[PDB]
Design an enzyme around this catalytic site. Sequence first.
Site, PDB file in Angstrom:
ATOM      1  N   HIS B  65      28.906   7.776  15.244  1.00 50.44           N
ATOM      2  CA  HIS B  65      29.331   6.720  14.304  1.00 50.44           C
ATOM      3  C   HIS B  65      28.790   7.017  12.914  1.00 50.44           C
ATOM      4  O   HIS B  65      27.616   7.272  12.790  1.00 50.44           O
ATOM      5  CB  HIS B  65      28.759   5.382  14.773  1.00 50.44           C
ATOM      6  CG  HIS B  65      29.233   4.990  16.127  1.00 50.44           C
ATOM      7  ND1 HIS B  65      30.501   4.491  16.347  1.00 50.44           N
ATOM      8  CD2 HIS B  65      28.608   5.076  17.305  1.00 50.44           C
ATOM      9  CE1 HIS B  65      30.589   4.274  17.647  1.00 50.44           C
ATOM     10  NE2 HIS B  65      29.456   4.614  18.242  1.00 50.44           N
ATOM     11  N   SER B  88      33.803   9.750  12.493  1.00 46.95           N
ATOM     12  CA  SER B  88      33.261   8.719  13.307  1.00 46.95           C
ATOM     13  C   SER B  88      33.965   8.655  14.621  1.00 46.95           C
ATOM     14  O   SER B  88      35.103   8.975  14.687  1.00 46.95           O
ATOM     15  CB  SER B  88      33.408   7.368  12.618  1.00 46.95           C
ATOM     16  OG  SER B  88      32.499   6.452  13.176  1.00 46.95           O
ATOM     17  N   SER B  93      33.338   1.590  12.933  1.00 45.69           N
ATOM     18  CA  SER B  93      31.876   1.752  12.894  1.00 45.69           C
ATOM     19  C   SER B  93      31.341   2.428  11.639  1.00 45.69           C
ATOM     20  O   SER B  93      30.140   2.365  11.386  1.00 45.69           O
ATOM     21  CB  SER B  93      31.394   2.504  14.099  1.00 45.69           C
ATOM     22  OG  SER B  93      31.873   3.826  14.104  1.00 45.69           O
ATOM     23  N   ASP B 142      29.890  11.498  20.821  1.00 45.70           N
ATOM     24  CA  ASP B 142      29.546  10.154  21.245  1.00 45.70           C
ATOM     25  C   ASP B 142      30.822   9.540  21.823  1.00 45.70           C
ATOM     26  O   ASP B 142      31.718   9.128  21.082  1.00 45.70           O
ATOM     27  CB  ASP B 142      29.005   9.324  20.064  1.00 45.70           C
ATOM     28  CG  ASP B 142      28.619   7.926  20.397  1.00 45.70           C
ATOM     29  OD1 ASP B 142      29.169   7.329  21.317  1.00 45.70           O
ATOM     30  OD2 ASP B 142      27.857   7.361  19.621  1.00 45.70           O
ATOM     31  N   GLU B 208      25.987  11.622  23.338  1.00 47.14           N
ATOM     32  CA  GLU B 208      25.198  10.449  23.038  1.00 47.14           C
ATOM     33  C   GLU B 208      25.180   9.362  24.081  1.00 47.14           C
ATOM     34  O   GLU B 208      24.165   8.717  24.183  1.00 47.14           O
ATOM     35  CB  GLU B 208      25.741   9.843  21.732  1.00 47.14           C
ATOM     36  CG  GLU B 208      24.961   8.675  21.174  1.00 47.14           C
ATOM     37  CD  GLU B 208      23.615   8.971  20.562  1.00 47.14           C
ATOM     38  OE1 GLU B 208      23.230  10.131  20.444  1.00 47.14           O
ATOM     39  OE2 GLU B 208      22.881   7.980  20.168  1.00 47.14           O
ATOM     40  N   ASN B 233      22.052  10.835  26.379  1.00 47.54           N
ATOM     41  CA  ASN B 233      21.919   9.454  26.760  1.00 47.54           C
ATOM     42  C   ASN B 233      20.783   9.261  27.736  1.00 47.54           C
ATOM     43  O   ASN B 233      20.057   8.285  27.633  1.00 47.54           O
ATOM     44  CB  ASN B 233      23.225   8.922  27.417  1.00 47.54           C
ATOM     45  CG  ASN B 233      23.149   7.439  27.709  1.00 47.54           C
ATOM     46  OD1 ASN B 233      23.234   6.611  26.806  1.00 47.54           O
ATOM     47  ND2 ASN B 233      22.926   7.099  29.033  1.00 47.54           N
ATOM     48  N   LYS B 238      16.075   7.761  24.932  1.00 46.87           N
ATOM     49  CA  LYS B 238      17.365   7.298  24.495  1.00 46.87           C
ATOM     50  C   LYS B 238      17.784   6.049  25.337  1.00 46.87           C
ATOM     51  O   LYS B 238      17.676   4.942  24.856  1.00 46.87           O
ATOM     52  CB  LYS B 238      18.382   8.449  24.562  1.00 46.87           C
ATOM     53  CG  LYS B 238      19.616   8.180  23.708  1.00 46.87           C
ATOM     54  CD  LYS B 238      20.511   7.054  24.215  1.00 46.87           C
ATOM     55  CE  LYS B 238      21.773   6.951  23.374  1.00 46.87           C
ATOM     56  NZ  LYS B 238      22.728   6.014  24.031  1.00 46.87           N
ATOM     57  N   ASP B 242      17.294   2.951  22.855  1.00 45.74           N
ATOM     58  CA  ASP B 242      18.578   2.629  22.189  1.00 45.74           C
ATOM     59  C   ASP B 242      19.431   1.661  22.997  1.00 45.74           C
ATOM     60  O   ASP B 242      19.779   0.610  22.496  1.00 45.74           O
ATOM     61  CB  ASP B 242      19.240   3.987  21.901  1.00 45.74           C
ATOM     62  CG  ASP B 242      20.684   3.963  21.504  1.00 45.74           C
ATOM     63  OD1 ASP B 242      21.481   3.138  21.939  1.00 45.74           O
ATOM     64  OD2 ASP B 242      21.029   4.873  20.719  1.00 45.74           O
ATOM     65  N   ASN B 243      19.710   1.982  24.248  1.00 45.64           N
ATOM     66  CA  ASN B 243      20.689   1.206  24.941  1.00 45.64           C
ATOM     67  C   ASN B 243      20.192  -0.246  25.114  1.00 45.64           C
ATOM     68  O   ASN B 243      20.942  -1.190  25.070  1.00 45.64           O
ATOM     69  CB  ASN B 243      21.045   1.824  26.291  1.00 45.64           C
ATOM     70  CG  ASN B 243      21.636   3.235  26.193  1.00 45.64           C
ATOM     71  OD1 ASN B 243      21.271   4.021  25.307  1.00 45.64           O
ATOM     72  ND2 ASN B 243      22.555   3.577  27.120  1.00 45.64           N
ATOM     73  N   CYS B 247      20.513  -2.638  21.479  1.00 47.08           N
ATOM     74  CA  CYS B 247      21.411  -3.758  21.650  1.00 47.08           C
ATOM     75  C   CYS B 247      20.734  -5.112  21.496  1.00 47.08           C
ATOM     76  O   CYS B 247      21.312  -6.073  21.003  1.00 47.08           O
ATOM     77  CB  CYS B 247      22.166  -3.676  22.996  1.00 47.08           C
ATOM     78  SG  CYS B 247      23.307  -2.308  23.047  1.00 47.08           S
ATOM     79  N   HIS B 353      32.456  -0.079  25.907  1.00 49.44           N
ATOM     80  CA  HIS B 353      33.264   1.096  25.580  1.00 49.44           C
ATOM     81  C   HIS B 353      34.719   0.744  25.341  1.00 49.44           C
ATOM     82  O   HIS B 353      35.271  -0.235  25.848  1.00 49.44           O
ATOM     83  CB  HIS B 353      33.160   2.149  26.717  1.00 49.44           C
ATOM     84  CG  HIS B 353      34.161   1.976  27.828  1.00 49.44           C
ATOM     85  ND1 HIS B 353      34.329   0.798  28.548  1.00 49.44           N
ATOM     86  CD2 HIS B 353      35.092   2.832  28.270  1.00 49.44           C
ATOM     87  CE1 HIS B 353      35.368   0.977  29.374  1.00 49.44           C
ATOM     88  NE2 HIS B 353      35.835   2.205  29.209  1.00 49.44           N
ATOM     89  N   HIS B 407      22.798  -0.270  15.737  1.00 51.11           N
ATOM     90  CA  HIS B 407      21.365  -0.242  15.926  1.00 51.11           C
ATOM     91  C   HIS B 407      20.649   0.055  14.612  1.00 51.11           C
ATOM     92  O   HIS B 407      21.187   0.709  13.716  1.00 51.11           O
ATOM     93  CB  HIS B 407      20.963   0.784  16.936  1.00 51.11           C
ATOM     94  CG  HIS B 407      21.523   0.521  18.299  1.00 51.11           C
ATOM     95  ND1 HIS B 407      21.449   1.401  19.374  1.00 51.11           N
ATOM     96  CD2 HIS B 407      22.188  -0.583  18.726  1.00 51.11           C
ATOM     97  CE1 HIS B 407      22.082   0.838  20.408  1.00 51.11           C
ATOM     98  NE2 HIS B 407      22.506  -0.358  20.036  1.00 51.11           N
ATOM     99  N   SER B 415      16.917   8.240  19.467  1.00 46.93           N
ATOM    100  CA  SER B 415      18.151   8.854  19.983  1.00 46.93           C
ATOM    101  C   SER B 415      18.424  10.165  19.267  1.00 46.93           C
ATOM    102  O   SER B 415      18.814  11.181  19.895  1.00 46.93           O
ATOM    103  CB  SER B 415      19.306   7.900  19.814  1.00 46.93           C
ATOM    104  OG  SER B 415      19.037   6.721  20.492  1.00 46.93           O
ATOM    105  N   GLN B 419      18.959  14.222  19.913  1.00 47.27           N
ATOM    106  CA  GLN B 419      20.119  15.040  19.512  1.00 47.27           C
ATOM    107  C   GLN B 419      19.708  16.354  18.850  1.00 47.27           C
ATOM    108  O   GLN B 419      20.222  17.392  19.158  1.00 47.27           O
ATOM    109  CB  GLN B 419      21.056  14.245  18.611  1.00 47.27           C
ATOM    110  CG  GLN B 419      21.937  13.205  19.291  1.00 47.27           C
ATOM    111  CD  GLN B 419      23.067  13.811  20.091  1.00 47.27           C
ATOM    112  OE1 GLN B 419      23.178  15.043  20.184  1.00 47.27           O
ATOM    113  NE2 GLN B 419      23.880  12.974  20.713  1.00 47.27           N
TER     114      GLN B 419
HETATM  115 NA    NA Z   1      22.217  -0.692  11.861  1.00 42.57          NA
END
Ligand code: NA
Lengths: 487, 488, 488, 487
Positions: B65, B88, B93, B142, B208, B233, B238, B242-243, B247, B353, B407, B415, B419
């Site tokens: 993104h 992206s 996004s 991603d 990702e 991921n 990660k 992140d997840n 969120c 998704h 995020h 994350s 990468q």
């Molecule tokens: Na942000």
Amino acid sequence: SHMALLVEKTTSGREYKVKDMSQADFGRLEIELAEVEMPGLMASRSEFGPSQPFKGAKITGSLHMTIQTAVLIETLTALGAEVRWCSCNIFSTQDHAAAAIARDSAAVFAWKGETLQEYWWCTERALDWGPGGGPDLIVDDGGDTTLLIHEGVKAEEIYEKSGQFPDPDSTDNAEFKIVLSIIKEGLKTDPKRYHKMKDRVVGVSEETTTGVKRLYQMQANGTLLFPAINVNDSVTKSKFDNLYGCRHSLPDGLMRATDVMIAGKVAVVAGYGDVGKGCAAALKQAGARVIVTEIDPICALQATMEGLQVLTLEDVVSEADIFVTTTGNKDIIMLDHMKKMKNNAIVCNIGHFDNEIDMLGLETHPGVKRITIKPQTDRWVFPETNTGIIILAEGRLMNLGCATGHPSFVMSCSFTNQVIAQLELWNEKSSGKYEKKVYVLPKHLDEKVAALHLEKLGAKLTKLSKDQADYISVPVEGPYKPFHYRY
Amino acid sequence: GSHMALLVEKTTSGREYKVKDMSQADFGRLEIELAEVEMPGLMASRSEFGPSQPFKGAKITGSLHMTIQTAVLIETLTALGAEVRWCSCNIFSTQDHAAAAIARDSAAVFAWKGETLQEYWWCTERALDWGPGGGPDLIVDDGGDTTLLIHEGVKAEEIYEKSGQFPDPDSTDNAEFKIVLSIIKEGLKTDPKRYHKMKDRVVGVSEETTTGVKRLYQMQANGTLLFPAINVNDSVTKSKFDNLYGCRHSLPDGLMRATDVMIAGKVAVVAGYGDVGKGCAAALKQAGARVIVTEIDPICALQATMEGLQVLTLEDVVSEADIFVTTTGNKDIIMLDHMKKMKNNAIVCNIGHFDNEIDMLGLETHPGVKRITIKPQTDRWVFPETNTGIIILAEGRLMNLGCATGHPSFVMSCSFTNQVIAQLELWNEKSSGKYEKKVYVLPKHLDEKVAALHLEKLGAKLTKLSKDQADYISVPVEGPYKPFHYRY
Amino acid sequence: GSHMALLVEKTTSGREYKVKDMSQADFGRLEIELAEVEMPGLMASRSEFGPSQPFKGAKITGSLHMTIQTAVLIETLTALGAEVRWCSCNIFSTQDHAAAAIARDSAAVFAWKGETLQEYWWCTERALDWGPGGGPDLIVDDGGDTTLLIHEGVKAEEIYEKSGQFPDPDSTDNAEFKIVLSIIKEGLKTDPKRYHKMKDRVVGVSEETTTGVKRLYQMQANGTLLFPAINVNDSVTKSKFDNLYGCRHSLPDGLMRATDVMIAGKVAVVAGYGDVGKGCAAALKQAGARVIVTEIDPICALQATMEGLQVLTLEDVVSEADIFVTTTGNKDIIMLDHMKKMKNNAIVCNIGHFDNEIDMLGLETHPGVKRITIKPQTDRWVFPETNTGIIILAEGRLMNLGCATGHPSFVMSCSFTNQVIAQLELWNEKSSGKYEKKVYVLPKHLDEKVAALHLEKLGAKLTKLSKDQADYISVPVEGPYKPFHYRY
Amino acid sequence: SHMALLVEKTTSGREYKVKDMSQADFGRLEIELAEVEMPGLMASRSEFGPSQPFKGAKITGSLHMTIQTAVLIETLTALGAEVRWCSCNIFSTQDHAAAAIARDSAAVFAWKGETLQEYWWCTERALDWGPGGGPDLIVDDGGDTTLLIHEGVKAEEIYEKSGQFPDPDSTDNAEFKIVLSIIKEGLKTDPKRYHKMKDRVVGVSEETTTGVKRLYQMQANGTLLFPAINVNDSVTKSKFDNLYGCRHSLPDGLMRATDVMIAGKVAVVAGYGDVGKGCAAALKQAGARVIVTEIDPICALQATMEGLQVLTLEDVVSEADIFVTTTGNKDIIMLDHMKKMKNNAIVCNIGHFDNEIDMLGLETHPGVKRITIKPQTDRWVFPETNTGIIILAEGRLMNLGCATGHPSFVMSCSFTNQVIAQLELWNEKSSGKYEKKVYVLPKHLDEKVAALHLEKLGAKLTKLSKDQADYISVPVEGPYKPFHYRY
Ligand code: NA
Ligand SMILES: NC(=O)c1ccc[n+]([C@@H]2O[C@H](COP(=O)([O-])OP(=O)(O)OC[C@H]3O[C@@H](n4cnc5c(N)ncnc54)[C@H](O)[C@@H]3O)[C@@H](O)[C@H]2O)c1
Ligand SMILES: NC(=O)c1ccc[n+]([C@@H]2O[C@H](COP(=O)([O-])OP(=O)(O)OC[C@H]3O[C@@H](n4cnc5c(N)ncnc54)[C@H](O)[C@@H]3O)[C@@H](O)[C@H]2O)c1
Ligand code: NA
Ligand code: NA
Ligand code: NA
């Protein structure tokens, strides 16, 4: 101690040694309540009762002798097993549970407030199936029964050749001196006791992180004598019992032992694995300001994400009101730390053994004095300062020692895994499926354990359509997650 | 060509781009400079690896993104010597100021907020098309669309090689796939061995997100996967950060920006209770909503109940709830039939998704329905039967990125340091043995390194094991500290 | 007059306004229509009282922040028969689309986001100046600036009446008060008995917020208060909901929009632990920050510690913390001396009052400092000594309204249903006895009514006492249910 | 009961009746710990010890006879008071606390597990200063001692005229029959006992919401005989003890009584005042899904804001696992509700008396059976269904009955207010400052209570500059908030 280390027997001839048999009726009343809270165990009895899969089996267990464990034992016996048991901690037995089991169901050698010599005697008794032999199966928690057998075999191999005995002088560990002396005494009566035992043992299932650590060490060095199932690392054990169980039983131990207000205090949790996560959660949710110590940067980062400060113990030792060790490691809270704590700081261990807190250093500090407030709450006063600290359960598991450990519902998750592990080992006794290695239960059985506990709570699961199951590449009936999924 | 043809623009130095508004570059730079401070893992990667230029000569196509966070990632890749082209992976996004600053200063970028699907796929093709010198060597993906295009492109090129036949969008009824087949058809007119070259040269892809990794395993299982993949991921640093915590931040941010609704006092339904659902439910409950979870997995359901959340089927709660959030990575979670039962102004969004967790197709064709756009990415769909509405966020696409900014930088640094590590590992083994046409994860010591690089910023002080203590728990002093199958 | 003079515009029907952009009216209407659903107390007030037109003939000047929420309040007043003129009580709090819709459809409005202080005071004067038919009869105020202008205006008019002397901004060194004296001076040229008329006709003021109520008690204590006041802030259904839960919502919203910073993992300092501080601390801790509270009140400090929050002085934490939020209603909380000790990119904001919780004056004059505007209402002030910055939100003015949208509709419905009730009570006693030149609060039964009007929306089902039970606890079945001094 | 209702005496002649005097040493050990947790009490002893403000005073208290209350009593005695005490609940006494106080400090008539006749006998004993008279001061919790005096005066006025006695037949309330019978018996020995008493009582300070309700009722009907200070409604009592204290002691009572896992359950909290707020907080933070019932729309709205569902009891009676009444009202959980509850639902009251839960209806339900699991945990089985419910502490305060009530730190806040209230009444005994009305302590003293507890917790207060104090229109030294501030 007033205990005489001689077995007693029921009218039917079954051996036992417990504190007080008169507590059996009370034990039974609380077991009746626990059954309702343990649907996984009760479902196991319904599913497998008809087939009596453990008919003819001899099972030794060395797991805390609580009301919860009573339900587990009575599931093994409902399924046909004959059982002998001991506790795996000197303070964790619930005497009424032990009495009920001794009276009604299984040989028990357990009481609250054992000495270490008594503890090891009970361990020997739980393994002692008499001349006919046994056990076929072992249920272990922390690995001490497994240890005794492995150490015993090793000693027997030396003795057979050179006639050399274990010598307690070879260890500075007061408790391991006990172990070596018991092995020596056993050589002097039956120098192949443990050989014979190991040749009959189908496998062991191990409850807890520290015990599984011991197993993987024996695997790695090629000494493990029989198959082992790691029950701890079922998802439905590690991420429930270790986490949510301590979230319940940590504050329970603190409150019963001390009645201290947690709200408003500073509490240090050493470690932030499953146990430390649960302990930190409880303390935070009770209104304490929680500081975490950690060696693992991932766990440390998790703690920060949860709004907890991460420091080393040395930065907070004079500030904190409550200290809880959760590490499974040694030498967390040393004498030098203790001497710096404020008057009546509470110090306890919910991890393992007696060495997270430096109990040895404390007890041997010149001029220290111990004042017992009540059983398992001790105030130690230092001569330099004339201030004290409060040690719970002599630095042994505080939740089981000062309260009643985890509650029934979560122990039903752990113990349904234990039943499944024992059934697997036993059903496969003659098949060669398991080698002398450490296994975990497959995911579909881990999921079955969870599923067995949903109805009690009213949780309504959604069913995938076939189209949806295909879309995420799982079966409708599971398993639902990849092998390495972490939950 | 067409009056409305999509055409690339070029910087003074000839680097291609297509963005909304290049005049937003200075603003983009200002926010990138703030993000850098919040992204110590990326900045540490620049300091450690910059001088040795490990990506010298490498060409990297990415599709993370096109946010300010991604901008810091891109500029870490370029600091390490890579040449980069970017798009992206979502039509809503992009942060336009981020895209402009990157286009101006650092990399070819084809991205704007509010793309059509036709534009989206054109941007993807452009991020891939390196011109006569070829490329990419490396892919950062991603969700797997870039990877998909390459695999579909190879297939089309095979057919073309054998018979001269082109793809025909008439062959599919999938609206989006028609677009993809069209792109490939027209692309065979310019370079009919584009994708074959690419798959001889591509070193690997680093992916990702959960759904992208699902796609990679499907290609590995069917034997079609063309190059190695690293599953970023499923690094602990990660998935579990992140997840989850990402969120926990960006779900309420999306809700508040898109609707301004009070979360406190409401009933919110979270479909799924994996890492994303756990973080969404946490945010909602933290904010004072009463959260109801749906699940298919009994373990996850039991987890939710342990956390004091009710677990029901959607049907049980559809008429009562105020907010619905899909987190599943699966299809057909909130159908038109469900939507017809919702109260006036129920908020319905997807953070998982694609566009198919919520039945946007069914909504579109519901007789007499009327879509009223409140503002970009907040749409009230009025049901004629009741003269009541539902509020759909971001057309059913990722609501956090589409309605807010996704995020925050700190967690994206976790994350995105994974990468960078993945990219370095694929490249450093460009001529190696180590990576076959399969999916791999990064080793635990590197996962731990990512976390360690973020502690100082937060003032977290780690304890060091003594040698004796490390032995006691059977770990090295320097780690790794946990067994292979540890779940954290 | 001046090239840049502020001049009113007029709708087709001649109603005056000054807003940013009238073309945003349709957008404003769309979001007002959503807000109505979220504001059951206001809508119930329209249904109950609309037909009887209780405000027929009344002229109401207001200064509640010109948000979408305020728009629903205005349109409740007009639904009840009032004529209304409005301004915002903050230079950054207007939602321009709300202002445009109101200007178009319902009331004279003088408000835009990003006013200067000169513009602010001109808007206030315009909201008050009803022209030859006179007015207002009623005032709705938030913070007391409208009330202050009237009181200062009367004083100036007294002096003018006696000696013909005008105010002289040279007489004060307070920059803002110079502006106020200028407004009054020029206003004496147009209507030198404006304020005397007003204070013969004004029925009362209803005051929204803690600091405004402080100002009212100062005027009551000194005998200068000119008309009755109802303290709306101290309804339970205002103070214990808006100040608390409102900030729990709007504090993180302001932080996230202005900076996008991850709150999780940070250290946040909340100065004050009254209702606003309690809500701010809750949000921060909910989001995963480690919250440190400062306080002067030992009761509030003990409360914070009960909630697991550390209580320190600012000096103890200024170099460590990442986010600072002032909630005090007091002056001189975060001084330049403190700012000079802060880490790079510490975020510093005020959600309490005015512009003086943070030492913006001291910041402005710090030698060599450089203000770099990131975007509107996010400014990075760079200290030359260290080449590091601090991030000031909304120029030190209310950050929630200035950087985001303030509180959400549902909780503002609680506050604003109290406003409607207060307005009705003042007016219905216009010729009465009941209200003297003092500060009053609404009675408990009306406070309870406000809550009751919000329960259905949330599905909360209240139990009814039996007669026997009501007697047992010594309350009426219909309430009130708690003693006069109950604290909730 | 095996208790003989005859007073015992210390060597020095001080009367008492307790369970077991041999528990005094244990009591003292826990009192020593509690002192450290009760800085407000200890500061009061330091501040006022020298002046002995209660020298010559006779104080009767009817407040739960816990370790916390022991610290309070020993503060009164450190300040010069002679003290007589009873508990205000049949299950709340901590027997070791009672023993220590009986031995060392004050006359105590209290034991855990009193019958109602014994309870009222102890109340009479605590008021019985012999022929010389007393008390001068009363510390009350729930109003029963105050009730007895007021009812006694009323009965005495009737008896003096017509010779009519109270008749227990005039009430259907089994416990109030006891009260009327004790008043009758007292008329037959001294028909002016309560007249003489009331003429000497300087005032009463009342601990709890229900007691204060009773006082305001007596104020309103012109029957209140002496000044009263409402301690409950100090900010540092209501918003600390009632809230945070129950947040601690509710889960403690549940865990000790039942060991049930709270996580994963549905729990109903009836009421959402201070007590209900604290109980709901504890349950939610332990992982239960909490449903609140309420009659007050403001409180209901607060609960929704906190993410709690608000329903009527009838909507959840068959779903919930745990029920907690917090209302101070009657007839919350009726027999009809109980009959619909799932097997082993836990039902308890933390509010008042015995009538929040319909214990009368339960006990009189034809064919019901009561099975005592252990003291204060009873399973009642219904004949229609053959399922049961679990009642805690016979429907009386569950926190004190099943555990140990609130912890010391928060009780130091409550009890410092009690000391301040008693000092005020007593210092002003001859001044006419107080009328026969209900008063609350002024804000500056409420703030002093808080301030006395900050150092223990490490909380560092900021000092206003004079300029700042002026700006918000408060003194530098406070008070800091307007009269009607709600905190
Ligand atoms: Na942000
Ligand atoms: N008492 C109970 O009821 C109960 C319940 C489950 C497990 N256990 C026991 O609790 C212990 C912890 O189990 P777990 O499952 O959480 O293990 P774990 O491995 O998940 O967690 C232990 C944590 O301690 C940390 N650590 C190690 N040495 C440290 C040190 N010197 N300082 C600070 N942190 C350090 C590790 O990094 C790790 O994250 C084990 O001994 C286990 O057997 C007890
Ligand atoms: N056990 C303890 O340690 C402890 C601690 C403090 C107070 N108390 C007692 O707890 C009780 C509650 O005290 P409080 O200070 O919270 O009082 P409160 O007045 O603040 O709260 C009681 C709540 O019950 C609600 N209510 C009344 N009748 C109801 C009904 N029929 N259904 C549902 N809700 C109903 C009321 O609206 C009110 O909000 C009192 O009896 C008090 O003396 C006990
Ligand atoms: Na237990
Ligand atoms: Na808003
Ligand atoms: Na207690």
